[PDB]
Amino acid sequence: ENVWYSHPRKFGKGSRQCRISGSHSGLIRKYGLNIDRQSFREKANDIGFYKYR
Amino acid sequence: AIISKKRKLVADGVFYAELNEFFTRELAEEGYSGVEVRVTPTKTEIIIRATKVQDVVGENGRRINELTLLIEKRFKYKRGTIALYAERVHDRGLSAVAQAESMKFKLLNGLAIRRAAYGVVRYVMESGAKGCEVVISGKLRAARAKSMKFADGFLIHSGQPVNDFIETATRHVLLR
Amino acid sequence: KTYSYKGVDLEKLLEMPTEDFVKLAPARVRRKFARGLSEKPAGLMKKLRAAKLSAPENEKPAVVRTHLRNMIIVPEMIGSVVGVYNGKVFNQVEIRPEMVGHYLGEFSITYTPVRHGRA
Amino acid sequence: SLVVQEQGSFQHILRLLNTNVDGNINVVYALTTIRGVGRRYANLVCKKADVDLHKRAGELTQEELERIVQIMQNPTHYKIPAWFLNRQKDVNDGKDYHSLANNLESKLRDDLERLKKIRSHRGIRHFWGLRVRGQHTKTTGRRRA
Amino acid sequence: MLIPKEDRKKIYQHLFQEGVLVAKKDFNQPKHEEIDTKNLFVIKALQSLTSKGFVKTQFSWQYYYYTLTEEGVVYLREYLNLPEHIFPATYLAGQS
Amino acid sequence: QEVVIHKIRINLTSTKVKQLENVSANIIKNAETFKLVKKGPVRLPTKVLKISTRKTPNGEGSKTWDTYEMRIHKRYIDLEAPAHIVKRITQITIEPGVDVEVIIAA
Amino acid sequence: TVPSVQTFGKKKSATAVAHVKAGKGLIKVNGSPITLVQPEILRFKVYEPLLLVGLDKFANIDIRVKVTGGGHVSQVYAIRQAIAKGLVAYHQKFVDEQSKNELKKAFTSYDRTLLIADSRRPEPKKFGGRGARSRFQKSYR
RNA sequence: GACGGAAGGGCACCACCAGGAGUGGAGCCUGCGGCUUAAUUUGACUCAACACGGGGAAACUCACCAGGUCCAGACACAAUAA
RNA sequence: GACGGAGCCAGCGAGUACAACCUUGGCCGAGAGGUCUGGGUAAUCUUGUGAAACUCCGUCGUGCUGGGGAUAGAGCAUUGUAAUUAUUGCUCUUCAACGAGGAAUUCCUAGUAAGCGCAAGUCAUCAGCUUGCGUUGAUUACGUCCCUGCCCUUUGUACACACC
Ligand SMILES: [Mg+2]
Ligand SMILES: [Mg+2]
Ligand SMILES: [Mg+2]
Ligand SMILES: [Mg+2]
Ligand SMILES: [Mg+2]
Ligand SMILES: [Mg+2]
Ligand SMILES: [Mg+2]
Ligand SMILES: [Mg+2]
Ligand SMILES: [Mg+2]
Ligand SMILES: [Mg+2]
């Protein structure tokens, strides 16, 4: 409820936020994925990226 | 969506992945295997694979409907635009995820690990594939943790003989 | 030797409008002034004024302690005891010449400035 | 291009604006030796004067030199605005100045003194003998005094 | 958590209407979709409801996945009084 | 009863090539059966979506990189054809994977 | 209209395209003569095929080369290749087999591509090194 | 099995020859270690740590230090209680 | 070689919605960067990414000198609620160490080495970084086990925490 609990979280690490764990380190924003690297590694074959070259 | 084609495709892929994850989380007892997303301009179809179909359905159509509702809520879809179809896999002993789930269930009930693994291997053999291997890592009722191999038939490891001809599932079991 | 702030002499600036000072200032300062005015230094100026009032007028005011190292002073202050926060410690600073338009953080050195080697 | 051989008229090594100006450097680049005078701006000054750049240091007649000096010391009148000179805007007069030879250093010293008086971070750093403009002293500046 | 009672009631009503609730782990934020309330409160309410059976919960991709059992539904109805034969979507209406 | 020629572009999008090929074949067959003016399935520069990522989840170890790539196939078709019937045609036959997009203009 | 042959030239990624027609004696790079190309030194490289064959074999020709890609040297090489290829194509179409053979012989006393397109294409730059084969710099301790 | 300043037989430009190109020298740049500090958060220490944690951090990040809020303590039962 | 002009040529990318992207073209400013407009949520528009390095005409000419641009001043913008402990950028002036680098050691055998850029990743703003392209394009091997390892075979081991 507090109108003093949050300052601007506009960019960098604020709005630039994870879409799996809730982390902030290693954020591939390419094609608007917003996934962490490690998670992506174990999921990319389902999202559709592979090891062709 | 109106967004770029490439981006749209990526988003769809991500959505699919998310769906898969959800199914893995939720449909443990329901015996989940795999998901497909078919998109027609008016109707979005998701085909779910499972072993205990009645459970997936609910009563008359309890659980599937709720899942559809959830899906609608999540990625913003108008009620009726999305649909679900839960259907059997004709060979349960080929889809790796299903096998993994079965193994997990065996473990949580209180079975011996080795025995369970052997049972799973036997089941796979009965189903009919050109060999399978089971890897069980961690504590095997010991303070020091080890690795296990339960191999039958013959395996492949490198190439495009991997993809399509192989199914791989990693599933972790939490215990006391 | 007296002092000229930016052309305009010492005495005239102790009671002088802010806008004029901004106009006759570095570009960064101008930009700062442009960007945000309402409810941005809250009432730092007001506090300073109050402090000035409470003083015997010939004496320097009571210490006003700010966490704002970011603050650039306007020439309406000057001769005001602004305690600047250095993470833990309040640093006392007195201003007479053109530290006006310069950040308060510059005068309270944050890191404790070295001992090192003893050789 | 000049076919002119020139007789004994040019005297090398000139004493101009107190600091010694050396011989046969190309006018602009002869002037650069003086502090406050720098390449591009020297060239500009020369252009303003209306002396051909492709000449010797000793070649310059006295009048031309005088003109150049005038241009340097009083810059604003000869169409040289802000993106031009040394102390733009300035802290002491409001007018901009193209400080020279033994002035710029003095100004710098004065600034340092003022900083010291008013105990600012930069001033403190200068007093110490440390690097100011965003440098990591983990490796930077091991030459000392 | 202590939620303004009316808001809580509204949330409950919405849940009943749906049979499905989301609200991501996006705390502090102004407002949830569909229901015009602060999200944290909603989440807490949901958790409370779950604590005794009632609702289901999954944390997947920070989403929260809230659906009620029939007993839970009954309890919800009791909480908000509401006459017989008012349906979520567990009771089938359409054709597929 | 309408009978009005549209002059319409139809774009396909697919991560899978075989499915796309099948769809193209289907479209060609449709064109043949109804006898319609077309520009034959035109290929595009296939956008390869490269995500360069260190394989290590901790960083401690040797510098190993993996470029996880997704080759995306476009392929479009241009149909100079009538109205309602054409619309009906350009809706049916769906393969899993490939996305069909029909635009507008009359 | 008079039949005319289209040819191309490749090196690295540079693409030349020559158009050989029947006419007066044109030899053109984009919109300019071979007397220009670019680097002045490498003017002889593009002129070389002509020198080899005989300049009289051009008294009835029109040549125009559209060149895109590469850098400069590569472009020049591509142009040269295209010209050679253009000539051979023309011979194939309009002239005689013995003539073609002669042309080939003249070229193959050098074989700086000319009639045969070059292999040797850029190798991908791998990770853990600035170059394709070049590894980084091993530090140890 | 390992190991041998053992023996044969083979290999390799993280081996060398025949050579490049340099770094190590200079300044800077970034990362360490070491010292300092309220804190300089940390994990890496032969390749296989040291432009590595995607780590090009002004808040965020975030972990550290100095301060100030907040309950996000479900639920159970006791008491409080209109 | 640097410094001026003037020639002129690339390939990967990436880029707008339920937000504030890549930005052209025309006027501002001497730069950066503003500004009204449109194009482009993609082979189309930015972008032929007219990219450097190079190419030609000059100017300078064995000089810590126009080589080097660190360090310092002072000023104008930009991003951001917030730039001081220069965020960056641009103009200025300031011109140090540095005459090809000890013992040492890395990397490389063909479109490779190196030079040279660019785009992307990070990103609100910033590349000296990585990751991928593409221009320019050599020299010398095609071999041996001497040093450093590795592989198997035999051999000897008072060693299996296995020569640390
Ligand atoms: Mg095999
Ligand atoms: Mg193989
Ligand atoms: Mg190794
Ligand atoms: Mg980095
Ligand atoms: Mg220079
Ligand atoms: Mg240079
Ligand atoms: Mg191109
Ligand atoms: Mg010099
Ligand atoms: Mg920074
Ligand atoms: Mg020993």
JSON list of C-alpha atoms (C1' of nucleotides) and ligand atoms in Angstrom, two decimals, chain I residues 1-3 67-69, ligand 6:
[
{"chain": "I", "resi": 1, "resn": "G", "atom": "C1'", "xyz": [54.72, 6.96, -41.97]},
{"chain": "I", "resi": 2, "resn": "A", "atom": "C1'", "xyz": [51.57, 10.70, -40.24]},
{"chain": "I", "resi": 3, "resn": "C", "atom": "C1'", "xyz": [48.51, 14.83, -41.93]},
{"chain": "I", "resi": 67, "resn": "G", "atom": "C1'", "xyz": [55.59, 10.15, -34.33]},
{"chain": "I", "resi": 68, "resn": "G", "atom": "C1'", "xyz": [52.80, 9.10, -29.30]},
{"chain": "I", "resi": 69, "resn": "G", "atom": "C1'", "xyz": [48.01, 11.27, -26.95]},
{"chain": "J", "resi": 6, "resn": "MG", "atom": "MG", "xyz": [48.56, 5.89, -36.13]}
]
